[PDB]
Amino acid sequence: ETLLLEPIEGVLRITLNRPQSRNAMSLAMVGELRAVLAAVRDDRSVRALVLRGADGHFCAGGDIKDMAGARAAGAEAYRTLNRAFGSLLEEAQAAPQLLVALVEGAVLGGGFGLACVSDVAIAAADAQFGLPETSLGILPAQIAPFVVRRIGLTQARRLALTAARFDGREALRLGLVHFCEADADALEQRLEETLEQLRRCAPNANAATKALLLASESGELGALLDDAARQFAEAVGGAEGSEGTLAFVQKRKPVWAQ
Amino acid sequence: ETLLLEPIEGVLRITLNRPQSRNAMSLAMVGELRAVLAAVRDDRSVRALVLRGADGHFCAGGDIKDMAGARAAGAEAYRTLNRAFGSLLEEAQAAPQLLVALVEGAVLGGGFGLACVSDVAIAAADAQFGLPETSLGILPAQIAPFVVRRIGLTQARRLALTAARFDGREALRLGLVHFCEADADALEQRLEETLEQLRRCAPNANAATKALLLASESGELGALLDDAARQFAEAVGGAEGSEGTLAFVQKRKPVWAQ
Amino acid sequence: ETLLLEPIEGVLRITLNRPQSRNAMSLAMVGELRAVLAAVRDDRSVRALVLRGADGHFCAGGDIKDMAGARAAGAEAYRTLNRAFGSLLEEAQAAPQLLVALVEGAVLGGGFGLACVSDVAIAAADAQFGLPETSLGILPAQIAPFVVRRIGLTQARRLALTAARFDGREALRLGLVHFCEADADALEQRLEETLEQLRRCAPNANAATKALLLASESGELGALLDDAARQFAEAVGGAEGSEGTLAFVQKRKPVWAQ
């Protein structure tokens, strides 16, 4: 495998583990990230995924050798390979779980895309972010809509057309990540606090809320509200909602937060 | 009512007034707010709305007594009453008036909802914002589209899926509110400043302008511009754009600014 | 002619030159800026455009001699000329070139609009921005969708409906421009730093990326990704890209960067 899975309680830790290449995205880790996501998709015991790069780097891009190797197969193999990386962005973005990305060192090209589809991104102040693609003659093609949705067209355009590079303090200022920490100790503390907040929140409740936020663009407003109101009733009447509102009234923690 | 109405000239102040429950939205209060908004919707003598909470809290969420009462009527009651709270947000968001929110203390759940549909929000630094909904097994269902519109998916996903509390200074940073003041004299000065800026501005112009902006979120650009051009022509030549452009070439205030 | 044009290698400078009306957008200027854009649209040797205003002023808005005289002509004249200014905004927004704006002095109404469609805006701390339209009884009708996209509904609704004015530093905090500097020597220096980052990026790659970016904001995700992935294979297969990947794997700069 190219990942290292450490399932603890309802938190699944996923480390990108090719430190030689700064955990660059080989073709297979795309396959292997997509299958883990697919494996936990319906699993409400899996409450949160934590995404980290091994050895001080999140992800420096798509793997050099594999992409070199790909020419032998031709441009139609680049399409469906590219699109399959697109599908990882869709499936990671739509993951019912809370996706925390812990980002240090290099966060470039497709590593940057991956950061764009997290619910929570925690950055090391000296991490370096960027979209090299066009200086290399090529396209941040699958990332494009996800960076727009991340930081807004105004910052995405500049970053993509000038290949500008920047640190975690700047990725924070640009609304690309939620937190920026000085060193490792403070990353983890930030990470553990984030996981304690998450523990307060119900997993079916989180999944449906998420789907609503994601859908809230598409998307005529009135119809979205009609449907949201149905989903709200369903949640109130289900096992999670009755426990959670009962817990509130009885001034206790709900089951999932014990 | 559950409200106190204060109409000073062109400014209708509206105070949520159930201080006992930190001004929780009751079924009655949503009804009254909707009735008031429809009352003035077509009235251009009413140029601004100020939305405020009695006793140092803005609004703490849905009223628990009413949520408790609805279980007796089942899923259909939860749906119909949640959707009507969605109708309040729609009709406040789309009000022809400038809607100013002065938010103090608790700004939670449906409370955080109303803040998200103001043209101008001014918060107390010690205000506490949050979406507790999924920490209770339910959904900020009607809120979802208005919060993603408010601050973007990237911030909304974190607030919603972690039930994070945070203060006024943070709410300014995240783009949730437009000003954060440290005390009540400051909060009030900002309010009256905003209101004097607003009185420069004509009411039919503001109204037309606010609809276009709201339509910009989802409207195909070409056809939106088409319509916008017709509206511009109808503004310049109406009995407001002519007074306005006149006051300008003359060296005086247009009448609405008197 | 209302414009000075100075090409140099890949960059084309365009200076708004009616310094006497604060370079106010006359009917003639609009037609001229449109023709330019159109001549260079398909020309990939023009890699960037730079917009600037003459005599320390960017653009104070719509020329008032031209706007007052248009009243002889009636509603349709205003409609047609307004829609024309929108088309300008459309055509600039969609320029396959990297569009840079340097912004000084007045940036009001119309001028505010051209800034909202640049890829990189660089502002003078002393620049004053604003949307005075409703204070004049009229609408920033064609601006409305571009500023919503620029800075988001939450900020655009307060600027437009209070005719609030703000400086270069504020315009940066609001995300309206990317860079702010205290003096022209610095505005200047930022421009060339910006242009150097760009020369690293290949012009066909940048045109295709910008198109993707522009089509994300509301263009269905799945279809978009399908097509982007086709495009990705072609960039990787073409002249740019094959050269870029090489120069990267090799020690050197690609040709467009030399």
DSSP state of C130: E
The closest CB to that of C144, out of B120, B151, B228, belongs to B228
Amino acid (1-letter code) at residue C11: V
Cβ neighbours of residue C252 closer than 8 Å, sequence gap 6 or more: none
Distance of alpha carbon C75 from alpha carbon B40, whole angstroms: 30
User: Which class for C215: exposed (0-12), middle (13-18), buried (19 or more C-beta within 10 A)?
Assistant: middle
Distance of alpha carbon C101 from alpha carbon C123, whole angstroms: 8
E-state strands within A119-197 = 120-124, 128-130, 165-167, 179-181
Please identify which residue in the block is written with the tokens 């859908």.
Answer: A215
Cβ proximity of B168 and B123 under 8 Å: yes
B91 neighbourhood in chain A, CB within 8 Å = none
Question: A158 and C175: CB-CB below 8 Å?
Answer: no
| Nearest by Cα to B112 from B148, B66, B154, B68 | B148
Rounded to 10 deg, the angle between the C143-151 and A153-161 helix axes is 70
Cβ proximity of B121 and B147 under 8 Å: no
Closest residue in chain A to residue C98, using alpha carbons only: A161
Q: What is the DSSP string of B78-136?
A: HHHHHHHHHHHHHHHHT-SSEEEEEE-SEEETHHHHHHTT-SEEEEETT-EEE--GGGG
Helix (H) / strand (E) containing A155: helix A153-161
Side-chain half-sphere CA neighbours of B44 within 13 A: 10
Amino acid (1-letter code) at residue A159: L
Around Cβ C192, how many Cβ atoms within 10 Å? 10
Distance of alpha carbon B223 from alpha carbon C95, whole angstroms: 20
A160 neighbourhood in chain C, CB within 8 Å = 206, 209-210, 213
- Any bridge partners for residue A49, and if so which? A12, A99
Q: How far is CA B162 from CA A12, A52, A119, B52, B156, in A?
A: 17, 19, 9, 27, 10
Question: C213 and A156: CB-CB below 8 Å?
Answer: yes
**Percent of chain C as helix, strand, coil, to the nearest 5:** 55, 15, 30
C152 neighbourhood in chain B, CB within 8 Å = 152, 175
Distance of alpha carbon B174 from alpha carbon B148, whole angstroms: 12
Cβ proximity of B13 and B102 under 8 Å: no
Q: Encode B201-237: b = buried (16+ Cβ within 10 Å), e = exposed.
A: bbbbbbbbbbbbbbbbbebebeebbebbbbbbbbbbb
Phi, psi of A85 (to 5 degrees): -80, -35
A232 neighbourhood in chain B, CB within 8 Å = 78-79, 82, 138-139, 141-142
The closest CB to that of B79, out of A120, A202, A230, belongs to A230
CATH numbers and ranges of domains, chain B: 1-201 (3.90.226.10), 202-258 (1.10.12.10)
E-state strands within chain B = 3-8, 11-16, 48-53, 98-103, 106-108, 120-124, 128-130, 166-167, 179-181
What is the layout of strands, in order, in the sheet containing B48-53?
B3-8, B11-16, B48-53, B98-103, B120-124, B179-181
- Any bridge partners for residue A100, and if so which? A50, A120
Around Cβ A154, how many Cβ atoms within 10 Å? 22
| Nearest by Cα to A114 from A34, A217, A213, A198 | A34
How far does Cα A256 stand from its chain's mean position? 23
Give all chains having 3 or more CB-to-CB distances under 8 Å with chain C: A, B
Distance of alpha carbon C171 from alpha carbon C179, whole angstroms: 9
What is the layout of strands, in order, in the sheet containing B128-130?
B106-108, B128-130, B166-167
C122 neighbourhood in chain A, CB within 8 Å = none
Cβ neighbours of residue A92 closer than 8 Å, sequence gap 6 or more: A33, A37, A99, A114, A117, A118
DSSP state of A255: G
Distance of alpha carbon A156 from alpha carbon C119, whole angstroms: 9
Distance of alpha carbon C234 from alpha carbon A79, whole angstroms: 9
Helix (H) / strand (E) containing C121: strand C120-124
Q: What is the resolution of this structure in A?
A: 2.2
Distance of alpha carbon A115 from alpha carbon A177, whole angstroms: 8
The closest CB to that of B137, out of A150, A202, A213, belongs to A202
Beta strand A106-108 with A165-167 is unpaired
The closest CB to that of B229, out of C141, C149, C161, belongs to C141
Phi-psi map region of A207: left, alpha, beta (phi>0 left; psi -120 to 50 alpha): alpha
* SS3 state of residue A258: coil
Residues preceding discontinuities in chain A at C–N > 2.5 Å?
A: none
Distance to chain C for A213, nearest Cα, Å: 15
